[PDB]
Structure formats: C-alpha cells, structure tokens
Amino acid sequence: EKNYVMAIDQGTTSSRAIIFDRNGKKIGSSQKEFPQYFPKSGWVEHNANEIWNSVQSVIAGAFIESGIRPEAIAGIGITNQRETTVVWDKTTGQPIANAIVWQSRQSSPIADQLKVDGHTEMIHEKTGLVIDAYFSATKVRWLLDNIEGAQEKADNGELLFGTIDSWLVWKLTDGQVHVTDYSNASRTMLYNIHKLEWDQEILDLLNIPSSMLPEVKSNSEVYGHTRSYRFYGSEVPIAGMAGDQQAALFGQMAFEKGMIKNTYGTGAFIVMNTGEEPLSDNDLLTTIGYGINGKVYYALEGSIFVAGSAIQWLRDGLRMIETSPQSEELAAKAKGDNEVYVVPAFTGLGAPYWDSEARGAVFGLTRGTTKEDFVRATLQAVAYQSKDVIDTMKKDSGIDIPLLKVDGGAAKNDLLMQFQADILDIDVQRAANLETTALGAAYLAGLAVGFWKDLDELKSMAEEGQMFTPEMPAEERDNLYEGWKQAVAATQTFKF
Amino acid sequence: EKNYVMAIDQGTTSSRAIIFDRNGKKIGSSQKEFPQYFPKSGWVEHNANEIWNSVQSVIAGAFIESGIRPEAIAGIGITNQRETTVVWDKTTGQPIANAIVWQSRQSSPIADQLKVDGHTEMIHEKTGLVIDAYFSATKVRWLLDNIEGAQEKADNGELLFGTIDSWLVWKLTDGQVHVTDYSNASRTMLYNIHKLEWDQEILDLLNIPSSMLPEVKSNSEVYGHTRSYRFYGSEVPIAGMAGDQQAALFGQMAFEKGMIKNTYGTGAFIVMNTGEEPQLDNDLLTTIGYGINGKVYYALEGSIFVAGSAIQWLRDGLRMIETSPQSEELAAKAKGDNEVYVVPAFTGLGAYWDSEARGAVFGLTRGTTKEDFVRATLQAVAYQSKDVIDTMKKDSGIDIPLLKVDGGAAKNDLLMQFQADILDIDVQRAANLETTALGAAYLAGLAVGFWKDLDELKSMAEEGQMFTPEMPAEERDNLYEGWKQAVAATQTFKF
C-alpha cells in the first residue's frame, strides 16, 4: 500500500531522507555528512558526486529504519541547499568540477564587475535579488571561465547547469529529466521571477547558453519517476521540489501573506509569504516562495549566511568546543553580563546589510570573559541579526509581525529561542518537528500525487511545539540590541 | 549479467557485506556495528531487528560504494555468529524478545540442571558438544521460560526458532523460507550430527516444540530467493550458508583432515577439519564443518569466548583506549616484566567450560601501567589459543605444525608473532582477513555454478604473512606457566 512519502533534504553539510506516513509522522530517517572543500579562503565547494552518494545512503537508511517497501512510497519530495551550483557534462554524466556552494565567495570578482557595469537595477528588476556571489549566476560564469574547454562544451550543448534539486532529479532519472522548481530557479539570478522564465538578457550578459538550463516547473507536480534501480525496484514519482528555505516556509503552513518563519541551521533565513504579488523589498530579497495550484506565491527574504557554521568554527577553527552540541551546554553555563558580542560574518554581512567586505569580529571582551560567555555570544548573533531582518521586513511590508514560526536544528536550543523572543519582543513558535524543511517537501510531493487532498488537510495535521513568549523588559532588550547595533557598525568600520 | 557473489557476515559485533568477482576479488564492502546489551553479569543480548537493519545497511553500503547493482549478483552467501538464538512469531515476524548471544551465561542454570539430570554423555554422543549455555538449546528454553506466554505460543506452532543464519534468510525471503545449514544446526545442541536430524529426545527434555524448527540443508545449495523489496529490487538466489567459524575454515581451503585455523574476532575459535568419520567424548567440540557434494565433513573445535571483545571492553567499558587498533601501540610500549595477567572470562571460560568464572587480573603492582594492562589483555587470546592447541594435540594425537589464521584482530603483527612464539609453531595469516565472508561466498558460488567445483576455489588461494617462532623455550614456558596459574586462580572465584 502506498501509504508513505519520502522527503530528501540535501543540506549544506549533510543530506537527510525522511519517510512520513499519511498523518505526517516520521516513520524513518537517515542523515549522512559529505565532504566540504575550502581550496582558498572564502571558497566553499562540494563534490556533486559525493553529494549524490550521501543521498543514496540516506534513502537506503530511511527505508531501513522505516521498514516499509519502496513500492509503498507514494511520492518523493526533494529539497536542498539553494544557489549551490553544479555544472555537468551530459555526454559523460560527470560534473565538470566541484559544485560551488552558496557559501562560496570565489565568484565575487564576477559579481563586483557586474555592479561596476551598472547592472544592479536590471538584476533586481528581473530577479528580485541583489548582485552577489551568493547566487548561482556568477558561480556558473566562474565555472565556465576557469574550467578549460567548458565554454565551448556549453556552447555546443554538452554542458548542463543545475542547482542541487536539479542535480538530484537528474541522477534519480539518469538524465531523463532535467528540471527545477520556481523557488530554486529564482535563487539563480538567471531567472526572471516576473515573466516566469530564464532571463535571456541576463544569460547573454554572462554568456550562459540557454541549452544548459533545466525546464522550470511548479513546486508540486510529477516531474517524472525514478529509474527502478534508483529506488530499489520501484519507479517512484518525484513530485515535490523546493529550495530548502521555501520548503520550510511551506512546511510551516505559511500559506498566507504576512506569514513568516525562520530556519536556524548552517545559516539562518527569514522568509515571509507575500502572496501572489511580489511592494518594497529594501535591503532584502524578493524571491519565489512556491508555485502550486496554478498560482505563484512570492516571498520576502532576509539571509544570514553564518549561523550554525559559526559553531562549526568554534569546534574546527578555534577548537574551543570539541563537539557542536556542546555549545548548548557551554552557553547555558555563561555567567557574564551578556555584554560580549560576536558578529561571525566570516563571508560578509547578509541582510539587511549586504556588506560583502565585512569579516568576523568580536566586541565587549574583558579579562573576566569566559569560554561560556564567548560561546553564548556566538550563538546569540543569529538572534540579533534575525531581529535586524524582521524589523526591516516590518518597515518594508508595513505589516506587523506578532508571531515568528521557527524550525531547523539550532531551534532546539530553548535558551536561544527564548533569547530570540526576548529581543524581538514577539512570540516565537517552534515547530513540533524541527525538520520542517523536509516536511514541506513531503507535503509538496504528497499534494501532487494525491497523498493529501489540499492545503486545508495539511493544516489539520499542524502540530506546534513550544511557544516562547517575551520575558525581557524593554530597557534590557533595548540595551542588548543597542550593543549589537554598535558591534555591527564597528564591524563594518573595519575594512582593512 | 550475473558476474558477482555477495557474502553477508553477520558477526557478534558488526555486520559486513562484501561483493566478490569471479576471481574472488573484493570489489565492494560495507561494515556496520550494532548495539550490544549486557543486562547482567555474564549476560549478552542483541536485538534481532537491529541485527537485521545492520545487515540491510551493509548490503546497501556495498552496492552504493561499488556501484554494482543487485541484479548482477549470481548468489548470496550467508554466514553468522553461531548459537545466538532468536525466537519470533511466524505471523508478525517479530522476535518475542532480544536474541540471546552465544556468549551469554543467562541460561547457565538451565545447562547446569541438564548436567545434574545426567544428560551430559547423551548430549556429547548426539551433538558432539558439551552441555553449556554457549549453545542454542538452553537459550530457547530460557526464552520459553522467561517470556510471558511464549511456551503456549510455541506449543500452538506460532513461534519459530532460528540461529542468525535462519533469521536472516527468513527476513530476506519475507517469511517464505525457514531453514538452516548443517554447520549452524550442529551448534544448537538440538541437532544429532550423526543421524543428521533434530534430536527428539533433547527437544522433549527441554520441552521445545518441533514446530519451531527450521528445516536443515547442506551448506551449498539454493535455499530460496530474496524478495525484491528485501534485496533492493532484485530476486537473487540465497545459496551459501554456514556458521562464521566454519565459513572461515572453508575460506582457508582447510578441506583436508588435520588442516586447522583460528579466527581472531570478538571471540577466537580454533577449528580443525577432521574429515567424514571423526566421532572422536572429549571436552573439545565435535561439530559439523560443512556439508557439500553429498558428503558431510566434521571438525574439532576449541572455543574462546572473549578475545577481541576484551579490547572492545578496554575501549567502551574502562574507556582506557580511544580506538580498538590503539591497543597494539600501547601493548608494544609496555615496559613491565610481563608478569601481569588478564583472564578475559567476562562471559565464563570456553574450551575449561567454566560458566562460573568471570574476568580477572593478576600480578598488579604500583608500577603497572596502562601499557602493561593493555599488553596483558591482548596476550590473553594468544594464551587461551595455546590452551586449545595443546588440548587438541593431546586429545587427537595429531601434529599441529601450522596454524592458519584470519579475522580482524589478526592484523596485529605483534600479536600474531607472540602467538607463534608461545605456541612455538608457524602461524600463517590469510591474504584477506575476512576469510569468513570469502568462505560464505565460495559456498554460494559453488551452489549456483559461479565456480564449477572445489578445486577451482584452490586456484584463487592467496596466503599472507607467515609468522615463525623466535621466542626461547625458557621464556615461553615461564610466560605460559604464569597464565595457567592465573586461570587456575581465576577459577577459584566463583560467581
């Protein structure tokens, strides 16, 4: 019986596969990390074949734990780290080089040039984005510039481009399907989010042949079926696709204008559904939330590049914590006056600053500052910048933001979420299942294959977790935020 | 199309799946540990479902890593930790409780009673075994005694018994096939190794319903085929099966009477092929090596319960070592007089057959270091192996000038050298330590015709490092006399 759906969440540092039952309950899950490469400072790459390997692994892992047959999977939902770029040769099936991660700044020179040539307005008008190496466009250009013979192959139609979602579907169908959904495509800076198609003007500006591009479809429909061997003897429908942050938005039931969520992970991303209309997106990003039921819902996004990866830095860089989970224990033991500020903008400041020159900085240190204080400050950075983002959204959209739905692994930290609610002075509702990104992808796929009937049925399945209500006084929260603003301003001041 | 054979080695500590080509070359593999449970002193249990999942994980891992697909597998060879007992509901397929591992002493009181009721001789004559909690028999009894309502369900034909090989074939065929090979069955202490039939007397003595038993087959024949959904999309023949120790014997090409090997793993097992007519009774085990070509080949075995698992204990129990391999480093650095002895009888003593004994340490002084402690722990397997070899020579009268070895723990050159030194005989390491899986693969390959006959297997034989004695006689004797005294002192502490 086809009573289950599988969601594959291809993350920045690990891949996950989760099998849900018709009640939206996790029956089985698997997670597997894959290699991270940093050839040069500011550069971040993944081997797309290794990513695929980690996905094969978690798919098997999920099946094993769940105990259900592959034939019982009604559909597959695919969600992934966005922007990350893979360019592969369709005559060999092999990537022409490592994929370039959304975190990478290796293509910044190309982005800078685009700005110098005055294309900022053009890009925004068409893509809703700011020119930055964060998006796919310049990563594709970088690959075509630096991989010998690649431009010629691209010009002759032998090369294909794909964000991770497209790469996975390509692998699952052995190239018989080269597709991407509106949400993932909108993150490429090559897609016109208004006319809903790859933007030829942008393509020509970056000399990117349209033959490299996948078809762009909605976020909920049968894109194709897996090759039998790819899914253990079953040709399962691949029916849901969405960028991870948009998947989380969907999973949070943020279906109406104003509904907003934040996912705390490697990075943190605040996304608000703005309805079928893209008004003001100053200092933020206008992007596509998802397309379903013949309609397209836009969103406003504030991107915080370094959040959880700041903890990885404490573990691998400073070797201050041994294990990432420890940060939770350490931060909770902090006795300092919470006057230490860490602005872990290792790769530049994200929204609403979008200052690519800023680097990581720390402030308020004293002889009495402990490891616990330091760890706490590092963890709180995401909470502060999230406020920067949310306040910017209030100003841009004019709509009040009384409630913030949150998810993501780092949202497990009660101390952090309470702090988030305290400084924002608004309610912070945590999802019962932190892997809401996967849930959203599952919902998308389920909807497409008739596993679930409509959005309303998804709402009925809604299961909320702990609600965090403001507990901090205005004087205190304001003083705390004032210090953060001072720290960020000082960070931007240092431009050596 | 079918140019590969896969061997699944469901061990005591981890599961492994290896894919071999026609030249017996390893093309893909995967290993996965699974939870070990020690509820009480001497008790050792596994969750049969967790074992199954670990097997599925390694099967997938081997395919994912090698890129080879299920449809290319000509046959599957199954090998496993022996004696370990699973009892499950034939309808739900759910175990009635945790599987009882071979090491477990939880059914010792039951074994003791059998000996009290004077059944030792009969058991030796029919099964070739000594009455001990080591074997499946008392574990099934323990389960039917302690699991509420189990006996009634068994009597009603609703429960099935199976050693791990049987459990895995059951899962792989989704309940269509309930079978076991001669070697695994011989380890249950419920099987007559001479008449080649379940022994009704022993069954009735332990009130075990015959309806629980799998049918017994040779070690090389198609037992059935995997269900597509149980083998990642393909129906593949399950055609090779043997207890892990017998598979290793087979993998070592130890097909002739006298050929002997020792596999160093969670435990250590010295197995000597004794041919078709060796009834031998003695305190060593008379067991079935393997049945093939219409013939049954027997073996003589000395079983050491704790070998590698003693190192595992240093890592997980005392947290004295970071990693298992780190044991060779520390041991090599020991400076003590080597007068410290560790008798790893954590689950009683094997071939002694003393289930009252527990782990002990002797010769400790203020200067005893971690290094000394680790060295003593490692040497224990070498010493216990000598206890067994000596017993075999004295009981069989056969000469043992060469001991073939395999198993993960055999990779330690210093340990193997010590082994050869203490025994004062040559120790030949297999080219591939996972000779157990190779043996299972060979049996499966022979069954389906992947390989035409036993002699073709020999053409793939590849030996590893040969270790020759170097240690004097005075040193060897002194070291060993100390061990014998340590074991004797250990046996005076009765749990």
Curated annotation (Swiss-Prot), chain A:
It comes from the Bacteria. Gene3D superfamilies: 3.30.420.40. CDD domains: FGGY_EcGK_like. One of its GO terms (molecular function) is glycerol kinase activity. Transmembrane segments: none annotated. Activated by phosphorylation and inhibited by fructose 1,6-bisphosphate (FBP). It catalyses: glycerol + ATP = sn-glycerol 3-phosphate + ADP + H(+). Keywords: ATP-binding, Glycerol metabolism, Kinase, Nucleotide-binding, Phosphoprotein, Transferase. ATP binds at T12, T13, S14, T266, G308, Q312, G409. Its EC number is 2.7.1.30. GO terms for cellular component: cytosol. The modification Phosphohistidine is found at R230. Pfam families: FGGY_C, FGGY_N. ADP binds at T12, R16, T266, G308, G409, N413. InterPro entries: ATPase_NBD (IPR043129), Carb_kinase_FGGY (IPR000577), Carb_kinase_FGGY_CS (IPR018483), FGGY_C (IPR018485), FGGY_N (IPR018484), Glycerol_kin (IPR005999). Sn-glycerol 3-phosphate binds at T12, R82, E83, Y134, D244. Glycerol binds at R82, E83, Y134, D244, Q245. GO terms for biological process: glycerol catabolic process; glycerol metabolic process; glycerol-3-phosphate metabolic process. Pathway: Polyol metabolism; glycerol degradation via glycerol kinase pathway; sn-glycerol 3-phosphate from glycerol: step 1/1. Homotetramer and homodimer (in equilibrium). Key enzyme in the regulation of glycerol uptake and metabolism. Catalyzes the phosphorylation of glycerol to yield sn-glycerol 3-phosphate. Belongs to the FGGY kinase family. This is Glycerol kinase. It comes from Enterococcus casseliflavus. The gene is glpK.
